[PDB]
Design an enzyme around this catalytic site. Structure first.
Site, PDB file in Angstrom:
ATOM      1  N   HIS A 168       0.834  -1.197   0.000  1.00 63.35           N
ATOM      2  CA  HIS A 168       0.000   0.000   0.000  1.00 63.35           C
ATOM      3  C   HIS A 168       0.873   1.252   0.000  1.00 63.35           C
ATOM      4  O   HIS A 168       0.660   2.160  -0.795  1.00 63.35           O
ATOM      5  CB  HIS A 168      -0.896   0.007   1.239  1.00 63.35           C
ATOM      6  CG  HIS A 168      -1.837   1.170   1.303  1.00 63.35           C
ATOM      7  ND1 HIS A 168      -3.095   1.143   0.739  1.00 63.35           N
ATOM      8  CD2 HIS A 168      -1.708   2.392   1.871  1.00 63.35           C
ATOM      9  CE1 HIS A 168      -3.699   2.297   0.961  1.00 63.35           C
ATOM     10  NE2 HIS A 168      -2.878   3.072   1.645  1.00 63.35           N
ATOM     11  N   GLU A 169       1.851   1.298   0.899  1.00 63.83           N
ATOM     12  CA  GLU A 169       2.746   2.443   0.992  1.00 63.83           C
ATOM     13  C   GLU A 169       3.524   2.643  -0.307  1.00 63.83           C
ATOM     14  O   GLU A 169       3.690   3.771  -0.763  1.00 63.83           O
ATOM     15  CB  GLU A 169       3.738   2.283   2.153  1.00 63.83           C
ATOM     16  CG  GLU A 169       3.105   2.207   3.542  1.00 63.83           C
ATOM     17  CD  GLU A 169       1.866   3.075   3.687  1.00 63.83           C
ATOM     18  OE1 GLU A 169       1.911   4.258   3.316  1.00 63.83           O
ATOM     19  OE2 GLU A 169       0.846   2.568   4.182  1.00 63.83           O
ATOM     20  N   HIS A 193       1.642   4.543  -2.861  1.00 66.27           N
ATOM     21  CA  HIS A 193       1.750   5.988  -2.699  1.00 66.27           C
ATOM     22  C   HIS A 193       3.085   6.492  -3.243  1.00 66.27           C
ATOM     23  O   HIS A 193       3.133   7.467  -3.982  1.00 66.27           O
ATOM     24  CB  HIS A 193       1.660   6.378  -1.225  1.00 66.27           C
ATOM     25  CG  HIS A 193       0.277   6.325  -0.668  1.00 66.27           C
ATOM     26  ND1 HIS A 193      -0.809   6.858  -1.329  1.00 66.27           N
ATOM     27  CD2 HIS A 193      -0.199   5.816   0.490  1.00 66.27           C
ATOM     28  CE1 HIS A 193      -1.895   6.676  -0.602  1.00 66.27           C
ATOM     29  NE2 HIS A 193      -1.551   6.047   0.507  1.00 66.27           N
ATOM     30  N   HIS A 221      -5.498   7.401  -2.782  1.00 60.49           N
ATOM     31  CA  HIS A 221      -6.426   6.452  -2.182  1.00 60.49           C
ATOM     32  C   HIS A 221      -7.573   6.102  -3.114  1.00 60.49           C
ATOM     33  O   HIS A 221      -8.006   6.925  -3.914  1.00 60.49           O
ATOM     34  CB  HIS A 221      -6.972   7.014  -0.873  1.00 60.49           C
ATOM     35  CG  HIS A 221      -6.033   6.857   0.283  1.00 60.49           C
ATOM     36  ND1 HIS A 221      -5.989   7.745   1.335  1.00 60.49           N
ATOM     37  CD2 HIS A 221      -5.103   5.909   0.551  1.00 60.49           C
ATOM     38  CE1 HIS A 221      -5.068   7.354   2.198  1.00 60.49           C
ATOM     39  NE2 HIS A 221      -4.517   6.244   1.745  1.00 60.49           N
TER      40      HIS A 221
HETATM   41  C1  LIG Z   1      -5.680  -0.200  11.491  1.00 58.70           C
HETATM   42  N1  LIG Z   1      -5.525   1.210  11.063  1.00 58.70           N
HETATM   43  C2  LIG Z   1      -5.971   1.706   9.875  1.00 58.70           C
HETATM   44  O1  LIG Z   1      -6.559   1.027   9.006  1.00 58.70           O
HETATM   45  C3  LIG Z   1      -5.675   3.258   9.654  1.00 58.70           C
HETATM   46  N2  LIG Z   1      -5.138   3.398   8.247  1.00 58.70           N
HETATM   47  C4  LIG Z   1      -3.826   3.502   7.946  1.00 58.70           C
HETATM   48  O2  LIG Z   1      -2.923   3.495   8.817  1.00 58.70           O
HETATM   49  C5  LIG Z   1      -3.444   3.640   6.443  1.00 58.70           C
HETATM   50  C6  LIG Z   1      -2.604   2.406   5.917  1.00 58.70           C
HETATM   51  C7  LIG Z   1      -3.237   0.993   5.882  1.00 58.70           C
HETATM   52  C8  LIG Z   1      -4.401   0.948   4.866  1.00 58.70           C
HETATM   53  C9  LIG Z   1      -2.215   0.003   5.352  1.00 58.70           C
HETATM   54  C10 LIG Z   1      -2.594   4.962   6.356  1.00 58.70           C
HETATM   55  N3  LIG Z   1      -2.167   5.291   4.999  1.00 58.70           N
HETATM   56  O3  LIG Z   1      -3.061   5.754   4.204  1.00 58.70           O
HETATM   57  C11 LIG Z   1      -0.924   5.127   4.543  1.00 58.70           C
HETATM   58  O4  LIG Z   1      -0.579   5.378   3.439  1.00 58.70           O
HETATM   59  C12 LIG Z   1      -6.937   4.229   9.923  1.00 58.70           C
HETATM   60  C13 LIG Z   1      -8.164   3.952   8.971  1.00 58.70           C
HETATM   61  C14 LIG Z   1      -7.495   4.091  11.391  1.00 58.70           C
HETATM   62  C15 LIG Z   1      -6.554   5.715   9.687  1.00 58.70           C
HETATM   63 ZN   LIG Z   2      -2.630   5.185   2.257  1.00 62.70          ZN
END
Ligand SMILES: CNC(=O)[C@@H](NC(=O)[C@H](CC(C)C)CN(O)C=O)C(C)(C)C
Ligand SMILES: [Zn+2]
Ligand SMILES: [Ca+2]
Ligand SMILES: [Ca+2]
Ligand SMILES: [Ca+2]
Ligand SMILES: [Ca+2]
Ligand SMILES: [Ca+2]
Ligand SMILES: [Zn+2]
Length: 159
Positions: free
Chosen positions: A117-118, A121, A127
């Site tokens: 996923h990262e 980006h 997204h």
């Molecule tokens: C378990 N926690 C979550 O699901 C959190 N989501 C994330 O930390 C994303 C990454 C995951 C999808 C790999 C952040 N991101 O967008 C990185 O590029 C929250 C939805 C709570 C924000």
């Molecule tokens: Zn993301």
């Protein structure tokens, strides 16, 4: 952490700067390599591992304050974050090491799936609104091929 730039070259490089304490280094190296292979499989992009700060994609694990201006939030919540294509910190991927990193089914988060996923980006993807797409903003463990048709379209649209 949203931009409208892509890489102008196709032979991309990455440097694994440091490691998490939860997994053996051989396991981490392999997870990242397999995460990159997902993308190079549907595009003309290639990924080469190097050992200097000169790489396009620099990878690192950090806790709370870790250099840039976006500290992590401890256990759960934000799992990691990456920057869009460009110079310097741009294109880099950071993982919160306050999280329990693992692989497959079980407690903890899949380092493999989150890395994929990262790196999405880091290659310019934003997204997705499709729940089953890898680029969906929420974490969801899954077995089988990670990339959804939507993810494949988005990446080929750029490269
Ligand atoms: C378990 N926690 C979550 O699901 C959190 N989501 C994330 O930390 C994303 C990454 C995951 C999808 C790999 C952040 N991101 O967008 C990185 O590029 C929250 C939805 C709570 C924000
Ligand atoms: Zn993301
Ligand atoms: Ca290929
Ligand atoms: Ca970079
Ligand atoms: Ca966190
Ligand atoms: Ca950890
Ligand atoms: Ca597991
Ligand atoms: Zn960071």
């Amino acid at each position: 952490f949203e931009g409208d730039l892509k890489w102008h070259h196709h032979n991309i490089t990455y440097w694994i700067q440091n490691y998490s304490e939860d997994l053996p280094r051989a396991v981490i190296d392999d997870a990242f390599a397999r995460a990159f292979a997902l993308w190079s499989a549907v595009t003309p992009l290639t990924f080469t591992r190097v050992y200097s700060r000169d790489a396009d994609i620099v990878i690192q694990f950090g806790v709370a304050e870790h250099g840039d201006g976006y500290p992590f939030d401890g256990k759960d919540g934000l799992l990691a974050h990456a920057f869009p294509p460009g110079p310097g910190i741009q294109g880099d991927a950071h993982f919160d090491d306050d999280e329990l990193w693992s692989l497959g089914k079980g407690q903890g988060y899949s380092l493999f799936l989150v890395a994929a996923h990262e790196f999405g980006h880091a290659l310019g993807l934003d997204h997705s609104s499709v729940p089953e797409a890898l680029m969906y903003p929420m974490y969801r463990f899954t077995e089988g091929p990670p990339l959804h048709k939507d993810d494949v379209n988005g990446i080929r649209h750029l490269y």
